A paper describes a structure:
Here, by studying CRLs in the [name]–[name]–F-box ([name]) family, we show how neddylated [name] ligases and [name] (an [name]-type E3 ligase) co-evolved to ubiquitylate diverse substrates presented on various F-box proteins. Notably, numerous cellular neddylated SCFs and some other CRLs have been reported to associate with [name], an E3, to form ‘E3–E3’ ligases in which [name] serves as the ubiquitin-carrying enzyme. We developed activity-based chemical probes that enabled cryo-electron microscopy visualization of steps in E3–E3 ubiquitylation, initiating with ubiquitin linked to the E2 enzyme UBE2L3, then transferred to the catalytic cysteine of [name], and culminating in ubiquitin linkage to a substrate bound to the [name] E3 ligase.
In the TS2 reaction, ubiquitin is transferred from [name] to an [name]-bound substrate. Dehydroalanine chemistry linking the C terminus of ubiquitin to an N-terminal acceptor site on a peptide substrate enabled capturing the catalytic cysteine of [name] as a stable mimic of the TS2 intermediate. The cryo-EM maps that represent the TS2 intermediates of SCFFBXW7 and SCFSKP2 show the [name]~ubiquitin active site adjacent to disordered substrates recruited to distinct F-box proteins. The arrangement of ubiquitin bound to the [name] Ub-guided helix and Rcat domain is preserved between E3–E3 TS1 and TS2 intermediates. In the TS2 intermediate, the Ub-guided helix is reoriented back towards the Ariadne domain, but its trajectory is limited: the ubiquitin-bound helical structure precludes the conformation that is required for autoinhibition. The switch helix of the E3–E3act super-domain appears to barricade the position of the ubiquitin transferase module. As a result, the ubiquitin transferase module is restricted—but not fixed—within a zone that directs the active site towards the F-box-protein-bound substrate. Notably, the cryo-EM data for TS2 intermediates refine to several classes with slight variations in the relative positions of the F-box protein and the ubiquitin transferase module. The resolution of the ubiquitin transferase module is lower than for the adjacent E3–E3act super-domain, which potentially reflects relative mobility.
Numbering used by the authors:
A (entry chain K): 5 to 73
B (entry chain T): 95 to 419
C (entry chain H): 316 to 390, 403 to 514, 516 to 554
D (entry chain R): 21 to 59, 67 to 108
E (entry chain P): 163, 181 to 190
F (entry chain C): 17 to 55, 84 to 149, 157 to 685
G (entry chain U): 1 to 75
H (entry chain S): 2 to 35, 38 to 64, 82 to 160
Amino acid sequence: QIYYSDKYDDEEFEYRHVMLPKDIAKLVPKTHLMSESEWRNLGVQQSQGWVHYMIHEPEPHILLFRRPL
Amino acid sequence: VSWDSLPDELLLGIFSCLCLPELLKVSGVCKRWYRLASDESLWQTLDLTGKNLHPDVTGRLLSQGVIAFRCPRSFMDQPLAEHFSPFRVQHMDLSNSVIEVSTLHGILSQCSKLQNLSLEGLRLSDPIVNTLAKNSNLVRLNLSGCSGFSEFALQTLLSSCSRLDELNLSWCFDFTEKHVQVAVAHVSETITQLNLSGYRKNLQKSDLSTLVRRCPNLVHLDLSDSVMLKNDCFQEFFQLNYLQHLSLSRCYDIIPETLLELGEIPTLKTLQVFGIVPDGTLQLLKEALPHLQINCSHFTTIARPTIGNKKNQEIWGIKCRLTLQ
Amino acid sequence: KCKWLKKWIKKCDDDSETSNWIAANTKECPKCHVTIEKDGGCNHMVCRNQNCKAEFCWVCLGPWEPHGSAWYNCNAQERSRAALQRYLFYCNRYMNHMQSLRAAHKLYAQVKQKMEEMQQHNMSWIEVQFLKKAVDVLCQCRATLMYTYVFAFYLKKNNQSIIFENNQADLENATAVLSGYLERDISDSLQDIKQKVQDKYRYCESRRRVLLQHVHEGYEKDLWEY
Amino acid sequence: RFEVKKWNAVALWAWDIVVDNCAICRNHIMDLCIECQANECTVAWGVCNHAFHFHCISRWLKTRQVCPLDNREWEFQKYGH
Amino acid sequence: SAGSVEQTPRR
Amino acid sequence: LDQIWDDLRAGIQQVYTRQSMAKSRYMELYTHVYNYCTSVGLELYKRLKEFLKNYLTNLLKDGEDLMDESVLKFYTQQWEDYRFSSKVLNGICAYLNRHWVRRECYEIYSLALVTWRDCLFRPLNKQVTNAVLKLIEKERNGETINTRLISGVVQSYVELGLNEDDAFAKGPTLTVYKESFESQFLADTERFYTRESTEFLQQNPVTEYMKKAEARLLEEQRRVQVYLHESTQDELARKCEQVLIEKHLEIFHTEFQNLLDADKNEDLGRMYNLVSRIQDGLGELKKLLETHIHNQGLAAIEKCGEAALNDPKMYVQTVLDVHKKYNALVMSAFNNDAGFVAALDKACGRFINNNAVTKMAQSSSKSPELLARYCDSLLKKSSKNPEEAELEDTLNQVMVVFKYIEDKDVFQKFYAKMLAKRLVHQNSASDDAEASMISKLKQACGFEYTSKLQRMFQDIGVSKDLNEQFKKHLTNSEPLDLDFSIQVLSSGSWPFQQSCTFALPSELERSYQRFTAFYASRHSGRKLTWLYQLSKGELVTNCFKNRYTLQASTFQMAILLQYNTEDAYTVQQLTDSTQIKMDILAQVLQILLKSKLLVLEDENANVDEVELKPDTLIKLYLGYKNKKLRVNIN
Amino acid sequence: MQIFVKTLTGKTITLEVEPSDTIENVKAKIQDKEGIPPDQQRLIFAGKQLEDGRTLSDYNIQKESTLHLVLRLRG
Amino acid sequence: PSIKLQSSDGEIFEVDVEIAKQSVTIKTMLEDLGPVPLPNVNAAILKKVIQWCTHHKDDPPTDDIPVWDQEFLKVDQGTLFELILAANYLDIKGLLDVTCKTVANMIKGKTPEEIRKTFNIKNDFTEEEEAQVRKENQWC
Ligand SMILES: [Zn+2]
Ligand SMILES: [Zn+2]
Ligand SMILES: [Zn+2]
Ligand SMILES: [Zn+2]
Ligand SMILES: [Zn+2]
């Protein structure tokens, strides 16, 4: 299902890369990035500050958010 | 056999039918071909997304006459050291690209006629946005999710620009109710597409009342995940007899009943209320209001560079011509 | 007769029935005793005054202990509640007729435009003639139906008044259908609607004549017991 | 003498009752009721010398059971045909 | 007479 | 390069002044202008600009100041030559139009057009236009206009609509035309027509002025298609209409009055068309027409006077004739109007419901009475039998004059009474005609209006249904000696009173009781109030030597059935044995004594003025001889 | 020629009025005179609930015609 | 009808009028002024041009150019060059576009020195700014 991971983080901000199954992962566009409220509308849940900030091409349906302090 | 008589017009005609790598290869032939490889028509539209290249190179290749430059999610990681005339380009998108503020200001110092503009994700300063204030002709604006900008320079920017009809300003963490105060006080009230979602305890209903009383024409309104917009807010929404997009998803204090009053407005076309109305009774909402698309458009396209079909190399219908496959 | 009309119009907030609204849904606070109305259905309230720090539901009217615990759970109201319903019914329809009487001018303009439109739509001024007559008789029917209600208030019910109420109800229904016809269907059933409107307004006029005759009969043979 | 050869005459069919108002729909009894006036009244007779319509007394008798000029139970006495 | 908690969920 | 420019200028000078340019030279010229441009040719463009300016000024110096009829002959001819020459020139140097002039970030033919736009702005933009105006002021007479001049001038003015960097190559960009030709044209047209109209309306009658005005409007709308450009039609038509009419409206109204006083039904249509052309002007003709027709019809029935008060048919025919004539008129005046029809109807109502007949009768309800009695006299079973093909037509006519009336209550009452008498005495012309009458009356004024009459018909249907069945019941009852026939009415519809306190003498009692037992038992409860005051019969009176028979009502029947025993009774013996009131008794005895079958004390005294107390003997005249038997003594 | 409103402390107060005011403005007037929360208030006159939409003469409030006020405690 | 066209070197080739109404210049010849000498078109080049006009007489009027050019333009080098030049001269839009695309597809994938070899174009601006302009577009 919706597999989270540890708090692997950069120097200042904090990341936690997630994994989504087929149904909720087959609508992420190759075009641009989702707003935080946009993926909230799509129904994913996590803490406050998690903006969808990049896409990695080898894993198209596997998201990597960002969060401040 | 006599190449030495073929003119500039025919050679430019040949170069109009070539791809970027070979085109840059043949620029190294002689001085004549060097002039011909930059004629303010070959470089009309360009796309170089993803890259991390030289700021002086991108400055020159923007000076050579690009009207629509498409380059999101990219790097230019080095400061700028050469300044030229105010750039003629009119379609600039830096949505979620990564670049330092020094290079950002070095490039944005020459903004003249930026018709469509997007700088999602980057850090900006008050002089940067007040140099952006030079552009009083901007129409589509997307400055969502920036950092460092202040209210004073923000509102001076808004007063400077006058063609404000698209505005995507969601998830800028430094927005407050005073920020939306200066926003309504300084945007052109002709605005019809506005995004201020996610600011749960940053905005306030009274400022939305100001926005709707000065802007009775806005159609595409977005303030989702903002619990501090109480039920009287709906009344001010009831003021707007022109809205067709209305996103107030993730608002616990709202109810499926009171939002029915919004459907009392026939102009309301689609609604984005993911979360406030649980499963089961949203069908009752649809039955009681039969010309409303409740939670059928998961994203807004207000000044977004691209949307749909998952390939969409075009931007706002202005298809880019030169790229790297 | 004008004694009862003077009494009715002499209301000044009716001088009595406001107190019936007080006895309907107002109960004083156990801390700051004042006319207080619960709304909603929550049944869990705090007295939202500037000074009152005392919470209580509607139906305790006493200790705050039950709601939140299991202490007690709330262990001529109706006899005067129905009078409010009757008064609201009668004054409500009185006001409905007054309101739909004050808008006669717009009615005249609308029907004159409709008559001109029908006249240029292949018919003579006779159309304007009978729509003007229909409007006039409808206005007269409302102007007497109002006073039949104000009489139908101030009397003690006997065997005869049920008939009178039934007749008023039928006449009112007819008047409503006539106003509906008139404002609904200028658009091409002109002959059929001419038939319908003619029959309806003739019937309404005759029916009003019957009501006035009945009232004067009641005054004559002296049956009306107030 | 005889002089009785031919004769023709006219007679007025009328309901066999004192003054005829039906006291409910207030129309003439030989005339028609509420329903029979606004788009088949016969006369139903009471056991206390009163008689009304069909469309009128049927409704009033469905609602209550009194003779509506005299406090007393209602039962039919004679139909009309 | 606050919902849909947007906190980070379990593993 | 300049080793080519001289030869190329020679070629260009050759292509103007068209000496039939050869094709090989066209290749020489094109090859020159090509091989120069691929050596970036702004200097060639400037050479062409200065060459065109030079040639144009050198041509303009010739032929200036030729006040009229020559500036046209010069202008249009040089315009044709210059257009064709510059078109061929643009053909020669297309390469500039392909590559260089494409970089505009100035097209050769349009350059030539802008250069001639210089020769336009001269007094040539005043001499030519003023001469065009003075020549087109040959509208009146002199028709060798030779329209090829005006057509050329107008085509040149349109094509010289400016084009240089407006937005792009536009074409039909008529601004120069609109601001240098049309405005002066409209001003001069207005001047000419406001002269001619007030010149003509002092030596002529207006009845001819409408003819000439129609001809003028058609003439202008005709010339627009032959000289000028299309987009002048509406504006010129509006100006001509605003000048010829819309200023003489006072004269038009004061003429319409006297024209309607006579009966000229053709020129009225013409004045209609003229005043219809302008916006919202007709609204005085309406008032004049309705006042006229009102006075006309009122005087028309004033002709007949009091002699029509007692004759409905003449009254109704007069009124309906007035309406017929004026509806025939308004069948042509406003082309089946919605407003003149309204004026017609207002006047017809206002002189039907209040006019001389009801002026002298002091009763506004008099007129419906006469209409009803006319319908009566039309509907009776008369001798001069009206055929149906006229019958229903006349009925529709009566319904017209009806539907203009409003006091429908009095008409309902009178028609009810008269239909009652007509059906009781069985004197009806055609029952189906009555049914058609009542049906169209119903569709005219709804169901509630025509209830009582519908009853009046259906119940006589019931009586016709019941009489023969009672006779069938009578096959086994042997009715004593008489043919019995009854009519059983409803009591609410038919307007009659109760009775006159009769006695029903001996013979008729058996049939009376038998029939009332047949009826009151065949139906639940019904109280027949047998009235005899209107019930005819017949006597056989076989006390005579002649066997006479008399047609008489029940009153005479009882008075003579008294005579069954004796023949010399007195008044009071009859009065107590018949219970007749004094006035009815006086009338019936007067009618009896009008014939000599009954005799008083005298035999041939005053048989009309005698008023004798009941102490008076009534005697059968024994040896009675009569003119004939079978006498309606009524 | 005024309107009287029942203050919750008794003592029916008076205002100044035109016969075509707006009920929200009358709410503003009474809140001005007191400070009462101007959303939890119902006006009661002649036994019928005075709504917010129409005007005084619509519900027939003439001059020197009192009314009353009741709270709308939301719990 | 018919029309003959003189070559720049003497020869004359009878040509159908509707065949030679493709060249917009000759069409504007026969539009106004309705042995024409062409001075900047070699003889055999005119022969090839008129062959291509002939086979495309029934035209309706990269980028997937049709095959008959590939079995047409299979010809030596400078002949192709003068085909392009003549096509620009007579404004034969079809053959102009197809030869432009042919040159475009023949320039791809060659070193600049072989470009100036086949084009026989002399080399100035060299050994002084070579690596410099290489650095101006080093990213490729
Ligand atoms: Zn309290
Ligand atoms: Zn309780
Ligand atoms: Zn009845
Ligand atoms: Zn009935
Ligand atoms: Zn009884």
